[PDB]
Design an enzyme around this catalytic site. Structure first.
Site, mmCIF file in Angstrom:
data_model
loop_
_atom_site.group_PDB
_atom_site.id
_atom_site.type_symbol
_atom_site.label_atom_id
_atom_site.label_comp_id
_atom_site.label_asym_id
_atom_site.label_seq_id
_atom_site.Cartn_x
_atom_site.Cartn_y
_atom_site.Cartn_z
ATOM 1 N N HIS A 11 2.946 2.316 2.297
ATOM 2 C CA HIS A 11 3.150 2.826 3.652
ATOM 3 C C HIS A 11 4.468 2.206 4.184
ATOM 4 O O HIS A 11 4.835 1.100 3.763
ATOM 5 C CB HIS A 11 1.996 2.379 4.578
ATOM 6 C CG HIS A 11 0.654 2.967 4.252
ATOM 7 N ND1 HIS A 11 0.065 3.922 5.066
ATOM 8 C CD2 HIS A 11 -0.195 2.680 3.240
ATOM 9 C CE1 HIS A 11 -1.102 4.206 4.507
ATOM 10 N NE2 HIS A 11 -1.299 3.487 3.400
ATOM 11 N N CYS A 19 5.404 7.695 9.390
ATOM 12 C CA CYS A 19 6.468 8.421 8.707
ATOM 13 C C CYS A 19 6.123 8.236 7.218
ATOM 14 O O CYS A 19 6.007 7.097 6.751
ATOM 15 C CB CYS A 19 7.844 7.843 9.044
ATOM 16 S SG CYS A 19 9.174 8.333 7.902
ATOM 17 N N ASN A 53 0.813 -1.233 0.000
ATOM 18 C CA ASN A 53 0.000 0.000 0.000
ATOM 19 C C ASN A 53 0.852 1.292 0.000
ATOM 20 O O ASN A 53 0.294 2.378 0.148
ATOM 21 C CB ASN A 53 -0.980 0.053 1.191
ATOM 22 C CG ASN A 53 -1.444 -1.270 1.755
ATOM 23 O OD1 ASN A 53 -1.067 -1.664 2.875
ATOM 24 N ND2 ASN A 53 -2.280 -1.972 0.996
#
Ligand SMILES: O=C(Nc1ccccc1)N1CCCC1
Ligand SMILES: O=C(Nc1ccccc1)N1CCCC1
Ligand SMILES: O=C(Nc1ccccc1)N1CCCC1
Ligand SMILES: O=C(Nc1ccccc1)N1CCCC1
Lengths: 269, 268
Positions: B192, B227, B190
């Site tokens: 991330h 982050c 995804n």
């Protein structure tokens, strides 16, 4: 895994893990490179060689000699999806006093079709002075009994991409990724930066749009120098070209000392 | 792997790979954390939940709801050597409207002895606004039929390390590792940053001498903020003592907190 019936090659199956896949739900090229390294290590263990990534003999250990990668060439046709079983077959061949070659064939375990292939050139070196030396006959004979005698090349073609000369990227670079440093996960058991990390650093300077609209088909990487644990790296890329080709350069952030160079070929999804 | 006989837990065996081991020929704590994530993902797939790391239901997908880690606690007794088979068993349990807990037990496949254990607290969140929400009864019921009803905790001890409050590291930090950025290998499907990457960033500020003379025994990590792919991180560590450390991950620029934790190490 296990050595094949004749004992001149080694086969192993791998199930693609959740954290090993990219934005396309298929294994990354670094996951593939890790798997080749894993099957290579298991082939060396199965016949008595070292398991530290250097695949040395007891004669080499006394002399402080190791095997290091000079070139790595990978060509993927279909990246395995999450949950797929991939079967990799691997073998070695001596190329005279220059060095030895390790080859790989990747297949789909379900269909049996070839989904990728790889070749890597290795050279013998003194691990302390980094000085190269041509292979001695006493060392050569220790490997011959584990390699096919007739030529068996994953890339047989008359004019194949694995043996093409790679030029040095000219400044300014079209794209760049600056200040890349390795962490503890990038080190191996001997505290050296893993060969795969360099492949990731090379691909960091490829723009995200290229990654999202294209798939990596071919990668050829020349290894020139090690990046120490406390070194910083600059990754440089320039378009040289449906298909997209790039010229790559890895150099140390400070002095600009070359550590790697290569080419990548991508195709539209 | 496969769900156990009663279907209220999932088991899987893993052979330790060459690139998964550290300086002493045993799997790293990040390799362990990756394996827990892999067995967790396989447990979710075996019963119909999402396989993107969010273990979501069709009701959650329509509402844009996901499950995110709030806390991760790992205790290792023996790190498996290169070539060893490790068997991990995992299960989930609801903790009311606060969230859900996923637990793990790591065993040696050869001896059967417990070589490690882990627990993680998860909370429900809107993936777009990052706003937390108390879990509804219609969502609760979809998971209950896949979790044990009686309590089953990997860390049963009353007053144990997995539920201790973690303070914020005070400046100046005794040790630091600054300018840490994630690469494409650190991202998931995804895009991330993977939860495991944060564990590696936390351990980067531990001095090499500590790593070479000690072994990581316990790690407790609180997750506060993500982050982004284009963010830079500063890792901060201070000795609080066996050796114990207080950790802080913050964004290089503004100093916005993304993570905090504690590690416990033992002499080899
Ligand atoms: O793995 C090997 N050699 C090998 C040869 C036959 C059987 C098993 C191992 N190498 C890697 C570096 C170059 C040599
Ligand atoms: O230093 C290397 N190879 C290498 C291999 C792995 C990582 C980094 C470097 N070489 C110098 C002579 C050709 C090969
Ligand atoms: O993996 C699960 N739940 C689950 C429960 C039973 C079977 C399979 C999966 N979760 C992770 C975030 C909290 C919920
Ligand atoms: O954002 C997170 N968790 C998280 C999880 C993984 C990576 C980064 C962050 N949280 C908000 C408050 C509860 C936890």
């Amino acid at each position: 895994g296990s050595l094949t019936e004749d004992g001149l090659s080694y086969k192993e199956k791998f199930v693609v893990r959740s954290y090993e896949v990219g934005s396309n739900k298929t294994a990354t090229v670094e996951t593939i490179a890790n798997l080749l390294q894993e099957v290579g290590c298991n082939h060396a263990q199965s016949v008595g060689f070292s398991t530290d990534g250097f695949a040395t003999t007891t004669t080499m250990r006394k002399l402080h000699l190791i095997w290091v990668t000079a070139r790595m060439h990978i060509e993927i046709y279909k990246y395995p999806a999450w949950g797929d079983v991939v079967e990799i077959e691997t073998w070695c061949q001596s190329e005279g006093r220059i060095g030895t070659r390790r080859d790989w064939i990747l297949k789909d375990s379900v269909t049996g079709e070839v989904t990728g292939r790889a070749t890597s050139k290795w050279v013998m070196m003194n691990q302390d002075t980094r000085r190269l030396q041509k292979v001695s006959d006493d060392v050569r004979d220790e490997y011959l009994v584990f390699c096919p005698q007739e030529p068996r090349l994953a890339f047989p073609e008359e004019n194949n991409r694995s043996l093409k000369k790679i030029p040095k990227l000219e400044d300014p670079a079209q794209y760049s990724m600056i200040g890349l440093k390795p962490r503890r996960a990038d080190l191996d058991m001997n505290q050296h930066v893993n060969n795969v990390t360099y492949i990731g650093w090379v691909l960091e300077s490829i723009p995200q749009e290229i990654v999202d609209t294209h798939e990596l088909q071919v990668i050829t990487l020349d290894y020139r120098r090690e990046c120490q644990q406390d070194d910083v790296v600059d990754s440089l890329t320039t378009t040289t070209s449906n298909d997209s080709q790039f010229l790559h350069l890895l150099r140390l952030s400070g002095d600009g000392q070359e550590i790697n160079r290569g080419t990548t070929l991508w195709r539209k999804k």
